[PDB]
């Protein structure tokens, strides 16, 4: 049913790949004892404010700690950050887009 936000850590499972139509495929693995849980997802500008104008993958969740999650997103143009997870330990990747 309704899950709460993951409180654990996320690490990149593979390198971020981009598609022809300017989206990105993010593969993350999760560390935490609270799965199944909803994955905190966000994007930011260089300043740090949340863009999050679009997220293709609806309702990203960790169902099993041992299994990684695919998330597709549409970052803004130029330098931005993909942010997976919450808190001081959140996974923060830089990204650049044509």
């Amino acid at each position, epitope marked *: 049913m309704s899950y709460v936000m993951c*409180t654990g850590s996320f690490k990149l499972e593979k390198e971020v790949a981009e598609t022809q139509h300017g989206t990105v495929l993010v593969q993350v693995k999760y560390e935490g*004892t609270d799965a199944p849980c909803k994955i905190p997802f966000s994007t930011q500008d260089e300043k740090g404010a949340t863009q999050n104008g679009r997220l293709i993958t609806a309702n990203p969740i960790v169902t099993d700690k041992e299994k990684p999650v695919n998330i597709e997103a549409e970052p803004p143009f130029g330098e931005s950050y993909i942010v997976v997870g919450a808190g001081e330990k959140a996974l923060k990747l830089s990204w650049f887009k044509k």
Partner: antibody
Amino acid sequence: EVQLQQSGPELVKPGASVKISCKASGYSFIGYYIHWVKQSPEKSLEWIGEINPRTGDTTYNQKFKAKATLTVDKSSSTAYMQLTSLTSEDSAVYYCTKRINWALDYWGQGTTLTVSS
Amino acid sequence: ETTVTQSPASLSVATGEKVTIRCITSTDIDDDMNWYQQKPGERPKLLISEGNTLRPGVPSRFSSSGYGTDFVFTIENTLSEDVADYFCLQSDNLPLTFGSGTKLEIKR
């Protein structure tokens, strides 16, 4: 700081059972998996299994599935491992660990189990 | 399971020399390899976690590398304090599996 304190040495007869404890402190016990590791007299390390202290969910190594049983107690923040049907092959040093950053870390001091009559 | 073959079983070097230990995995594990030191009478301690990540407080003379199935652990300028057993642990999938260990000794 983070600490895992294991129970003392055990001398058990062949055929009997034993239950080693592992008291956690210095962090949210609920927040991290506890794993158990066996170290044989020949110094070889085998992974026994893991337990989620929040839900009690466990995953075992197939090699230890019929011998080991992992439990937890949120109240005393203590993880337990029970070994049944003991033989001299079970004589070894047993460690408990906290999995964090995907690695086994903050190992306990170990518990020496001797299976002899 | 993912089999981990470690070599050599035993190694001896003089103070200041390079130590090279290796672990080969039966399956592809990316860089999910970890390295542990165990001094006599002590418990294993994590020197290096996944992606050649040196643990805080661990001397910079310890390093690692590899991606896929071929993994190496290195000691630069080996000190006499470094005598111990060294183990690798694959953290890619369950069950977790260890290398059989390497015994390090000093030539003097």
